[PDB]
């Protein structure tokens, strides 16, 4: 009585696909089914970017036509949707925060377009980053065989639960040398569930700057931990400024789960939707500090000018004007009052909008600045 992965795999392999996408080029990659009914397939962005035609081939051979749903190249995640799905098999996703270095992994993909290829390995390490200092990267590293074409494929645990999406290998020659990286499933969950609900990735920010924490900085700042996030500075009017996070603080944990590095921490919340409440574990002056937070974004404010109504149907008064804005090109200044536009009088932000809803090629605004009555022009 021998062991084998075949039972687990014959349940999972129908859920991993191969993708064909077409200075004209032809490309090949892999994808994994997220929703059985809607035909959603997750895949790497560098596979279906600049795609005119997207053909998906299932495990049985059935070809399908797919089109784009969402994309986020900062994390190299893209979601496509099979058109007219018939009898599709979704995969079961696991929480990658339960992963541990040494757990056995199985990678599924289409290396060199050969067809679905299954490869085995272990969790080589976790939390790896740095291969593109501006990309959101929190890779699972694995010694499982992964080559050109395995991108967008499935990295699953021994129960078949999806733990990550194979993305890139470290290889001086373009062929696997036992170092493959996969985006953890939890980032795929937060990213794809946004591409469905919003179409793109609603990016939130906390308003803190920081650098990594080395064993050399731990000495100078009387800090105990040797790896984390060092709060250099917090922007005012930011969630952290509001939450009372001061400079020189050190972020040790996130929601209980400790942090491995700033670059991992940056990539985690880079995938969280705006408004995602969370809790952080700080460390200032040798005191353990917990803090709750709320992401934010980076009347009818149009093109960088905040405006509301003035008087009883007396038009729309501009309230602020950011310099170097579309508003600055138009010349409008804070305190300016609109009476009408395009020979139509404006009483409130509704009548303004119904001319903006009419979408004209040029916009002539009948404002009054100070004592004078002038016109402004747009578009």
């Amino acid at each position: 009585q021998m062991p084998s992965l075949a039972p687990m795999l014959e349940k999972v392999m129908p859920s991993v696909v191969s993708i064909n996408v077409e200075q004209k080029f032809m490309a090949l990659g892999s994808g994994v089914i997220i929703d059985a009914d809607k035909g959603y397939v997750v895949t790497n962005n560098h596979v279906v970017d600049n795609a005119t035609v997207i053909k998906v081939q299932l495990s049985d051979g059935r070809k399908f036509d797919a089109k784009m749903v969402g994309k986020d190249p900062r994390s190299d995640i893209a979601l496509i949707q099979i058109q007219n799905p018939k009898n599709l098999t979704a995969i079961k996703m696991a929480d990658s925060d339960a992963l541990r270095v040494g757990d056995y992994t199985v990678a599924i993909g289409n290396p060199f377009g050969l067809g679905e290829t299954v490869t085995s390995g272990i969790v080589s390490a976790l939390g790896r980053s740095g291969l593109n200092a501006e990309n959101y990267e929190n890779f699972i590293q694995t010694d499982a065989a992964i080559n050109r074409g395995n991108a967008g494929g499935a990295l699953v645990n021994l129960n078949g639960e999806l733990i990550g999406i194979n993305t890139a290998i470290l290889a001086p020659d373009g062929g696997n040398i036992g170092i493959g990286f996969a985006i953890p499933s939890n980032m795929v969950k937060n990213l794809t569930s946004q591409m469905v609900e919003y179409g793109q990735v609603k990016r939130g920010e906390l308003g803190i700057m920081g650098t990594e924490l080395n064993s050399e900085l731990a000495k100078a700042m009387k800090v105990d931990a040797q790896r984390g996030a060092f709060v250099s500075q917090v922007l005012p009017n930011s969630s952290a400024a509001k939450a009372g996070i001061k400079a020189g603080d050190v972020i040790t944990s996130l929601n209980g789960k400790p942090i491995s590095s700033f670059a991992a921490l940056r990539a985690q919340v880079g995938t969280m939707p705006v408004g995602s409440k969370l809790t952080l574990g700080l460390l200032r002056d040798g005191k353990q500090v917990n803090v709750n937070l709320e992401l934010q974004q980076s009347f009818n404010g149009i093109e960088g000018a905040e405006m509301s109504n003035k008087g009883k149907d007396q038009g729309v008064v501009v309230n602020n004007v950011k310099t170097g804005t579309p508003a600055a090109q138009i010349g409008l200044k804070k305190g300016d009052v609109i009476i009408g536009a395009n020979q139509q009088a404006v009483k409130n932000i509704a009548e303004l909008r119904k001319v903006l809803d009419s979408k004209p090629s040029v916009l002539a605004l009948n404002i009054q600045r100070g004592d004078s009555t002038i016109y402004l022009l747009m578009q």
Partner: peptide, 5 residues
């Protein structure tokens, strides 16, 4: 290495 989050 001074990114923003």
């Amino acid at each position: 290495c001074y990114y923003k989050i």
